[PDB]
Each structure stands twice: as structure tokens, then as C-alpha cells.
Amino acid sequence: MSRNVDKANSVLVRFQEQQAESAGGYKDYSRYQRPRNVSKVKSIKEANEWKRQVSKEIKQKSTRIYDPSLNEMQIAELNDELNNLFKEWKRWQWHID
């Protein structure tokens, strides 16, 4: 399990995380992938967390896309990615509450 990722997703760590989730309510919304279809999330806190995560992602995307080699295609691709992120964020701002 060299290079840290393996360590992170080693069974023991996972178990610990699960335990934390069970007792006290420590989740790491960084750690899990954000769900595709909203309205399968009855809790508000979770939703908020997800929204926050997406915002963070968007910010990250923004930070990188103004790099100096602007003509490279990665940046262009991200522009679409950025849009997608924005859309997701908007969706997360649903009007149930």
C-alpha cells in the first residue's frame, strides 16, 4: 500500500470511518463521490455538505483554468466541466427547503 491512497482505502481505515459515521456522525464528504440524482437525500445536512463539496470543486476548477498555456485543450475541456459543476450546484439549490 505504498503512495498513501492504498493506506487510506485500507480495510482498517474504512472500518474506522464506518464506526465514526455510526457513532457521532463523522462523515467525510470529500471521501465519497457526490451522488448523481438528487432527491435521494432526505436529510438537509447531507445535502448542504454535498453542495459545499461541489462549490469547492468548482473553485478548484476555476483556479486552474486561468493558467498561462491557455491554448491547450485541457483548459477548453474544463470550461465544459466548469459549466457542468455550475449546473450541479444549481440543482443542489433545489426548493424543497
Partner: protein, 197 residues
């Protein structure tokens, strides 16, 4: 077997590198060998060696040497100040794509005073600069809203060199002290407010 472009490249490398560093040079010339490269250099490339012919007296001397140091030919060469093979000869007497590619490579090498750390550092700096400009752009965009510029995060209690004034050394209170200096300073600062505005 040695081609002329390759030879030229080798010579260039030697001026770039060093006549006692025959690995890099070898690498530069994909087909020729490290220990061979040095030999080649010794033979043809180095200017101080007099590869050209010489007068009759010299020839005579060489022949005498040959007689009196039975074919101890390197020694003879040394004595002469001449190269060996040439001396011996005298005594006896009495594809394109590859070139293009290698040249390109070689040129890139010799010119670029770079590697991992040199290339990385500048690139990193550039990236940082880009980031900074992006930030500025963002703030410009959101100017109607009140926005503050993000500070460089501290690592272990450092100074932000805007405020505080850094480790100040005195003006040193002298004898002909006059109070206009302060006024002048104030005046100077007045202008910068205007600039800011």
C-alpha cells in the same frame, strides 16, 4: 566509422561539456562509443594537436627517433608534439533522416541549460503568476461586491511585509536635524492616496 556532422557535434559538446566527461558526449552521438569518442577527439578534434604536415628537418628527426626507439610510437609522437597514427603513416611513407534528428536533439541539448529542477522551478513560478492574475481578474469581475485579496498562508510565524515595517533600522538622530522631512513624506503620501482612488 565517423561522419563529419557527428564530429562537429562532438566538438561542440566538448566545448559545452569537458574533455574529461566522455559519457554525456557519447550519449549525444547515439552510435559512437564513450571510450571511442575520447579517442576520436584525441585524434582529430582538439586544435592544439598539429595534424598538418611539416618541414624536411622534422621528418628527418622523426625517422631518427624511429631508428633509436624501435617503433615505440606513442613516445615518438609525444617527442614530436604530433599525433601517433599520422606520424606512423609519415614514417611508412618515408542516414540523412538520422542526421536531421540527431542534430535537432544535439542542438536542443547544447542550447538548453536546463533539466528537471531548472525547468520545473521557472514553470512553477509561471503557474503562480498565472494564478495571481486569475485572482485579480476575479476580483475585477466582482468589484461591485466588496472583495479582499487573499494573503499568502503563513507556515511558521512570518511577516507580511506590507504592515509592521519589517526589522527597521533607525534614521539615526543627527546634529543638523530639520523637521521638513516629515512634511515632505506626508506630501509624498498624499499623492499615493490619489493614485489609489
Amino acid at each position: 566509422v565517423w561522419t563529419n556532422v557527428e564530429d562537429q557535434i562532438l566538438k561542440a559538446a566538448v566545448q559545452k561539456y569537458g574533455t574529461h566527461q566522455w559519457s554525456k558526449v557519447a550519449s549525444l552521438l547515439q552510435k559512437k562509443t564513450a571510450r571511442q569518442s575520447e579517442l576520436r577527439w584525441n585524434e582529430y578534434l582538439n586544435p592544439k594537436l598539429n595534424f598538418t604536415e611539416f618541414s624536411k628537418e622534422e621528418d628527418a628527426q622523426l625517422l631518427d627517433l624511429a631508428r633509436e626507439l624501435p617503433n615505440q610510437w606513442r613516445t615518438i609522437a609525444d617527442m614530436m608534439a604530433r599525433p601517433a597514427q599520422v606520424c606512423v603513416e609519415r614514417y611508412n611513407r618515408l542516414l540523412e533522416d538520422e542526421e536531421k534528428e540527431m542534430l535537432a536533439e544535439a542542438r536542443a541539448r547544447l542550447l538548453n541549460t536546463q533539466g528537471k529542477k531548472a525547468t520545473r522551478k521557472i514553470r512553477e513560478r509561471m503557474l503562480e503568476e498565472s494564478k495571481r492574475i486569475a485572482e485579480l481578474q476575479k476580483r475585477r469581475e466582482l468589484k461591485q461586491a466588496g472583495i479582499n485579496v487573499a494573503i499568502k498562508k503563513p507556515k511558521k510565524k512570518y511577516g507580511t511585509d506590507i504592515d509592521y515595517n519589517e526589522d527597521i533600522v533607525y534614521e539615526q538622530a543627527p546634529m543638523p536635524g530639520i523637521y521638513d522631512t516629515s512634511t515632505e513624506d506626508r506630501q509624498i503620501k498624499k499623492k499615493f492616496e490619489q493614485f489609489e482612488r
